[PDB]
Amino acid sequence: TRPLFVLLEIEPVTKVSSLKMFIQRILAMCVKNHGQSSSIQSSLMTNLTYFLHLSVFNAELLKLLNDEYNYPQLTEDILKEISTRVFNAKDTTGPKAISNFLIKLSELSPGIMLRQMNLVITLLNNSSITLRCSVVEACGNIVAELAQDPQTMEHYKQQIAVLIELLEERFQDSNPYVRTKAIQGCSKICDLSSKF
DNA sequence: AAAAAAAAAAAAAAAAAAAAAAAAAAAAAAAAAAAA
Numbered sequence: 001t002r003p004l005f006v007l008l009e010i011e012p013v014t015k016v017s018s019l020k021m022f023i024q025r026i027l028a029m030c031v032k033n034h035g036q037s038s039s040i041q042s043s044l045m046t047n048l049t050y051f052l053h054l055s056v057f058n059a060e061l062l063k064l065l066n067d068e069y070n071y072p073q074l075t076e077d078i079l080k081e082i083s084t085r086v087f088n089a090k091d092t093t094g095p096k097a098i099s100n101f102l103i104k105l106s107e108l109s110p111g112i113m114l115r116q117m118n119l120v121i122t123l124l125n126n127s128s129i130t131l132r133c134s135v136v137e138a139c140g141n142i143v144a145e146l147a148q149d150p151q152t153m154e155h156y157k158q159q160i161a162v163l164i165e166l167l168e169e170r171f172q173d174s175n176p177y178v179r180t181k182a183i184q185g186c187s188k189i190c191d192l193s194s195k196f
Numbered sequence: 197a198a199a200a201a202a203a204a205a206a207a208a209a210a211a212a213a214a215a216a217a218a219a220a221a222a223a224a225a226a227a228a229a230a231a232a
Contacts, residue, residue, distance in 0.1 A: 133224095
């Protein structure tokens with residue numbers, strides 16, 4: 001696993017679809033068939049902290065694991081680590097990469113990532129701008145895409161209602177960009193008039 | 197009974213510095229062009 005993680009550092013390798021797909025499936029088989037859900041998650045966290053272009057790779061790997069390899073525990077642990085992660089006041093690429101990863105994951109698999117959203121909400125208290133915007137955007141996309149399945153709404157009424165109430169309360173903030181993200185999320189929610 | 201010498205108004209240029217107008221840095225949204 002280590003040599004492929006080192007080779008993933010350079011950007012042009014990530015752009016090609018075949019190699020990215022092969023690395024995604026090999027990482028999925030490593031996580032599922034051979035366990036070791038601790039080294040791989042730490043490597044992904046290191047790559048996401050030190051690099052910006054690997055957020056989409058992480059989200060796609062998590063989506064592939066959730067769909068075929070039905071192992072949502074890795075995503076739960078990654079989200080918990082993101083919630084408990086601390087950033088310095090000097091670096092800004094780390095929070096931006098985290099934000100991009102959360103946005104892509106919310107675009108990919110709302111349902112798996114919704115389970116740990118209760119601990120993710122605790123990250124909203126951070127003074128970081130991009131992370132707050134990403135949390136708002138992720139909440140909006142999760143509640144918009146989960147709207148299509150009635151079973152998902154029925155089974156998860158309490159937390160989706162809490163998330164919508166928090167989004168409504170987030171209409172006032174020091175950052176205008178967080179307010180803009182909240183308004184965009186509300187627009188995505190109200191794009192359909194069948195329910196709510 | 198002119199002639200040096202000291203005291204005193206009058207007057208150039210010179211040095212000074214923090215406060216305000218103006219310009220650059222950083223993150224994000226919108227518009228146009230290229231690749232699939």
